[PDB]
Symmetry: D2
Subunit: 726 residues, 4 copies
């Protein structure tokens, strides 16, 4: 039962493009990629080659194929300890999934700042451009279970654990700059509303159901983040192509004790890019693991996800100078008002070894801050501090979750805490309390100071009575949704209208749809009317007369809120499908692959069967997947080289591949006789912007294709796609 003679069962331990080699554990794929945290896991990494199969007690197993029984057709015997241990371990493999963000995908990397930030913070990880901090990052959806699909419409989580020299800092953020609700007390109400309904546990991975829109209609504070969710921000192309935000205002504290308010940002260096809805929903069926897969394969290819950390900084004295409250997590701070200052770069460059041990058991918590950082009174941040430690006690089995290898600090940790389930550390200290004289009081408290000091909270002034009351300054709900709406391109606005229309059409109780349309009328009449028309609802005269909400500190728009208004495309790490035929013109393929390789764009060679095809010059071309096996949903663009086109001209799947790519606004390039396929997509002898066409695939043909790919999608095609039946 052995490995093939040719070694083909084992991936090469070098970077390789997606599909070229089977995927593997990060330490076997990239053994020479290291960082302090990855090295520190070596105490628990376990190999396998050349070792005997044993029980967990170290007893060699002779027959792992059979239970012990009284005769070979007889009853199994109670004394089979080998069977019992193996089955008992299997029986207890599962642990509770995260209450939210159960579905997530993670990787290791490192961070470093561009310059010391000691003027504004004493945080050690921000103190020196040449001090590298290992990180572990998990990206996630919110609503669905661990086994739900990746490319749903949802908010995404973006959690980073920095293993710093002065402690672990977890920056536990999402991919939009606000949240749905103002006070943590409502969190279980909002999450219950979005999650599968309690009677029948439907729907998975979708906000398109009555209870969510019932809560939204009755809680207008939710409308800002609902706008972001209904836009294409809700369906990113990759975790590499979305923004990250800490949402809350936090504090930075410098050595002089000065507090500066801050909001955290991550900028994706691969650019912002999202799917369109029909593509994202069909992709949850064709590959529900698409984002997990794409992230792992990018890292194996060397297309490391990179993000720039940035800070919006507001001096203490400017706390009240905006027309929103800085502590309200449903309000964003527009970059036109407060620019994002670039802080440092994070690069994710190694996949884990074991998903369960490292991803599933990772515990992030926004209370894990370090000296130089502090909280504010944001009432959603405040309540989050009661949750993340608590939930970890059932999910991870008790209070020693920081000893699970992935969660361990790389810096020293010593205290008087003892015992708890699954206690790993064996403490030698004669004392388990302080103050003590029997160990001369060690370990000892450390005064706060400029570097290496103990944690002290900023001495913020508190004055108020003990109340359960929402601050009046939080009671405005329409101006930020409007700012967001007005900052989108026209095609982005169409996509928002379509998201609301699609979701509300799934709400069974029509009055809820009506109540939501009335809320949209308080944001923008054009948005409200367009959603209403799709729902067969007619706005009343009163609704038509609702005064729009005020501008945000005079802003009519802020283009930083759009995915696409400002070009920032990067083609490196994108993928093209190349549709083969049984006599491919090799000069086309040479030019195609050469130009793709120059820009770091991968290719997948597709055909109507697996195996190989031979090109016109005898080159044997291995086939990656069939047209049906790897649909156009999984690539950024489609190229059809010249060759024996009649081979594929009447193939339904090949035609369909182009129809689906066209519908989803992807660039398509057709060389030589492949231009015969123009007829399937109904599109003119003169040509069309978004369709590259020439006699052969040369320098020019490929430059045009790659230019289109840098703009991500062919938005100008949108009016043409409603008539195509795909």
């Amino acid at each position: 039962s052995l490995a093939p003679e040719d070694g083909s069962h084992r991936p090469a331990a070098e970077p390789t493009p997606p599909g070229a080699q089977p995927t593997a554990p990060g330490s076997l794929k990239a053994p020479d990629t290291r960082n302090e945290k990855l090295n520190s896991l070596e105490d628990v990494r376990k190999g396998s080659e050349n070792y005997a199969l044993t029980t967990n007690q170290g007893v060699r197993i002779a027959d792992d194929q059979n239970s012990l029984r009284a005769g070979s057709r007889g009853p199994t015997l109670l004394e089979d300890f080998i069977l019992r241990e193996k089955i008992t371990h299997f029986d207890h493999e599962r642990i509770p999934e995260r209450i939210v963000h159960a579905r997530g995908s993670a990787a290791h990397g490192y961070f470093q700042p561009y310059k010391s930030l000691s003027d504004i913070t004493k945080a050690d990880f921000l103190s020196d451009p040449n001090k590298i901090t290992p990180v572990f990052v998990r990206f996630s959806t919110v609503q669905g279970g661990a086994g739900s699909a990746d490319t749903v419409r949802d908010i995404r989580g973006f959690a980073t654990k920095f293993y710093t020299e002065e402690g672990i800092f977890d920056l536990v953020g999402n991919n939009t700059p606000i949240f749905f609700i103002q006070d943590a007390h409502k969190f279980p109400d909002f999450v219950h509303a979005v999650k599968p309904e309690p009677h029948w546990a439907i729907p998975q991975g979708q906000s398109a159901h009555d209870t969510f829109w019932d809560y939204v209609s009755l809680q207008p504070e939710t409308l800002h983040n609902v706008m972001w969710a209904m836009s294409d921000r809700g369906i990113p192309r990759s975790y590499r192509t979305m923004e990250g935000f800490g949402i809350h205002t936090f504090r930075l504290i410098n050595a002089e004790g000065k507090a500066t308010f801050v909001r955290f940002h991550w900028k994706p260096l691969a650019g912002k890019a999202s799917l369109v809805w029909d593509e994202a929903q069909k992709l949850t069926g064709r590959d529900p693991d698409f984002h997990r897969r794409e992230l792992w394969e990018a890292i194996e290819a060397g297309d490391f996800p990179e993000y720039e950390l940035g800070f919006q900084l507001i001096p203490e004295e400017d706390e009240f100078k905006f027309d929103f409250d800085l502590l309200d997590p449903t309000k964003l701070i527009p970059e036109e008002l407060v620019p994002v200052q670039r802080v440092g770069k994070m690069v994710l460059n190694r996949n884990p070894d074991n998903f369960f041990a490292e991803n599933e058991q990772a515990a992030f918590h926004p209370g894990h801050i370090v000296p130089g950082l502090d909280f504010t009174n944001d009432p959603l941040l405040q309540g989050r501090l009661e949750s993340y430690t608590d939930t970890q006690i059932s999910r991870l089995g008790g209070p020693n979750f920081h000893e699970i290898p992935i969660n361990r600090p790389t810096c020293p940790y010593h205290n008087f805490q003892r015992d708890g389930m699954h206690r790993m550390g064996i403490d030698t200290n004669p004392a388990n309390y302080e103050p003590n004289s029997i160990n001369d009081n060690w370990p000892r408290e450390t005064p706060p100071g400029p570097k290496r000091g103990g944690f002290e909270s900023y001495q913020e002034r508190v004055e108020g009575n003990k109340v359960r009351e929402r601050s009046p300054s939080f009671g405005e709900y329409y101006s930020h949704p409007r700012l967001f709406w007005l900052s989108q391109t026209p095609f982005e606005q169409r996509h928002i209208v379509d998201g609301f229309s699609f979701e509300l059409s799934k709400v069974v109780r029509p009055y809820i749809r009506e109540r939501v349309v009335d809320q949209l009328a308080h944001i923008d009449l054009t948005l409200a009317q367009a959603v209403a028309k799709n729902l067969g609802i007619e706005l009343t005269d009163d609704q038509l007369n609702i005064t729009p909400p005020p501008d945000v500190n005079g802003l009519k728009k802020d283009p930083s809120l759009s995915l696409y208004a400002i070009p920032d495309g990067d083609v490196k790490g994108r993928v093209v499908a190349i549709l083969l035929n049984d006599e491919v013109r090799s000069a086309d393929l040479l030019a195609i692959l050469k130009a793709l390789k120059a820009k770091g764009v991968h290719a997948k060679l597709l055909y109507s069967r697996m195996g190989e095809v031979t090109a016109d010059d005898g080159t044997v071309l291995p086939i990656a997947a069939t047209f049906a096996g790897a649909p156009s949903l999984t690539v950024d663009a489609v190229i059809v080289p010249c060759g024996n086109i009649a081979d594929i001209a009447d193939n339904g799947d090949a035609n369909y591949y182009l129809m689906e790519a066209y519908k989803h606004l992807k660039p398509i390039a057709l060389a030589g006789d492949a231009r015969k396929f123009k007829a399937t997509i109904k599109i003119a002898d003169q040509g069309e912007e978004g369709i590259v066409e020439a006699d052969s695939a040369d320098g020019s043909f490929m430059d045009e294709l790659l230019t289109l790919m840098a703009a991500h999608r062919v938005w100008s095609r949108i009016p043409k796609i409603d008539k195509i039946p795909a």
Copy 2:
């Protein structure tokens, strides 16, 4: 610095006698002691000196004295993540105690065989006299909680984890050679009966209650082990001075495949020694930690517990050669019929560092055997195999309890099991199943063989129908209790009678007492009558006429079953109280201490207060304890030197000290004017055997005293103690 200037907070890191230094974690007390297991724990040992106090996430704490609040008399704030972690870990410190044997005390050591046993077993740890195997041993009671008292009347557990090169072997035994019940199906019934009664959860650490003796009276299989429990076996002096047994017949399997039946023995190299009942019961009040303390202090002193492993070996063809069934765990194998063959020595030479991490979390399971051993059909052993892995899933929080440091094999372990709560090991194997090609089928099964082979069970023949039926060969209940009884000295018999009499006096429902008396009449008439008289029960004429049970294979006694019939005294490690006065005769103390030192006997110097007293010659004598502080219960003998006796002659505590020791049969030595104390214990002018007296404490005064100590107690004093009010 809170430690004293003089460094008297820190115990000397060298062997010191009990009470000389404060006790300490083993790696601090005895850093030079080592074995392979203790070395392999070093990766999880955590020190403390010179380290900052931190959270578990590695953030330095500045103020570990206060919560974060709004104003120094204001409310505590939710944002206090340092408070929240510290209190949350504290809130989750406890894990379930063991369902049985929850009270126990453990130490590290090592084992070495005297010679290779390869002719009878291929067990690697028995293959070479040079092969030393680390062990971890936990002794225990059975009934009481982890916080119950040590010197109760109960069975004791004696569990040894051998960290062998071919897997962990757990020898999970007790201090008597049989158990109470025959089939594992009744274990919850017998354990419910002996445990605190379910309405009110009384009594702790005691079988002296109705439900226990109800069960016994209805289940005569239990009488054998009940005789043992009622004897002085049920109240050992020390874990160092008790026997151990595996109880069941197991098999040894050699390299040629030959099975030999075996029963396991531990022989205490310090000899056999028990308390007397009143002393044991009082001792649960004055020092409920006495066995735990004595074991730890013996190891700190270098009085390492030593035991010899012994095997009773019975050829397969002798299975049926006895009057009892070899597979019946209520039957012992008389050493007169099958001698114990010496196998090797175990030495316990290092205390844990942390009680919770190493002792409380240790998991032993008799299913944990290695190649060269195997099971038999003993139906109590059979059922044990269903329980010990199971219970560890809740007690230790899931199926990775073998990854808790104390439980980890020292030899390799590799398999395809994955996940589970608190998973430590990060598996890099591409495969988590077999057969696989993708990791060339590693780790791989190993055929069985002479050494380093896979586990194969002995191909014992099974034939019979599927039945829930007791073997008729097990249905004999009285002959072994009788053999045990007749093998005891007359004072041991007296103490058995008094154990049943006291326990049955605490049974509220008189009929249960009568029913037990009826059972005893089936064992021996002298026994039954003597208990009956203590209970005001008169035997009937039918009871007086029950034929006693047959002898066991012609034996009318076996002196190996007695604690004391064959003296095997060892004074090393025992302890003597020395009652001081304010003008001690220094020459007496010098002689006493010199003699005790030479035989490795410790001393405690006692007075009526702490501090120091000064001898006739100006020698300053420090006081270890008061008379009331360290009662006679806690030592093996009492010496009163000469001096200013009038100082203590009218001290009630000093007089009582001697009365209590006298009652409990301990040697007492009185020098010079200390002889005045003869009157308090009513000793005749010309003396009596067991009281050592002279004008001074020597020439022969110390030899006489140490001769009495070697015989443990003064049994000939028994007729005398009833008159003494103590």
Copy 3:
């Protein structure tokens, strides 16, 4: 039938003095003692007389004496689902004991006010002397495990669950009017100091050891409660003969919104009484369940613990 002919196995369901009858579950001993909470437990109370022995799945058991095996001297079979459920349930009986106050003894009762307190509090259970509130009270020591002794020197816990018409109120007090420490942040330090020391887990149920007195010496805030623990307060004769205190100042709030500061007290109607030290220590060996037994037998006798 295994019971005696004369019925002497079953205790009389009438009050009887200590030792006169075997003690029994409270609904069998005093079936007509009732309060709203006791009655509400009837949905989960399970009897036993005259019912077949079954598995937890309701399958009747023929032979509860033997495992299933291949031959009467053969190996035990994996298919014995009856043996497996019974042993599995036994294997999982224990739950973690309380981190502190693990040793404790409890009973049901009721509370009634002497007068309406509506002038000082709107708490419904204090609104009318005819308002009867069921209670469940647990008395405890602090340091020792669930299996440690009762008559140790320790503080005692005195916790009352009031099942009121407007919610459960738990008054979680001790038998001294102050605590050892000022700020909850130090609780794990104080508790670790008094608890068995971590190297060897000694001593049980005792403050008489180095780490406790090390902490007290370095933390003079402890000295007040330490005085109480060193007094005979530390060794009550009975949970019926000790005081209870809430310790903290709380507030009462009335219907007008007026706050009054309050401290809570329980005053024993059997009066105050403690043992002496030598008696208490010795009693931990002769009867480590002495307080638990005393309380149960007092209630069986009709000597109901009463507190004001």
Copy 4:
């Protein structure tokens, strides 16, 4: 035991039998049933041995396994009949 938190999973309402269930098992996490039986073991006299074993029979009898003959050696071996 892990998925449902302990050995009292048959007391979760959906899993409860509708017929009587009585035995000597006690405690476990999440225990709902409050047993009043003086005994928690059998055989006992203090509750006249109730709840009692029931012989097998045509209806309402105890469970007894069919007495299938077993004959063979203790082996970890697949039957050739399965190959």
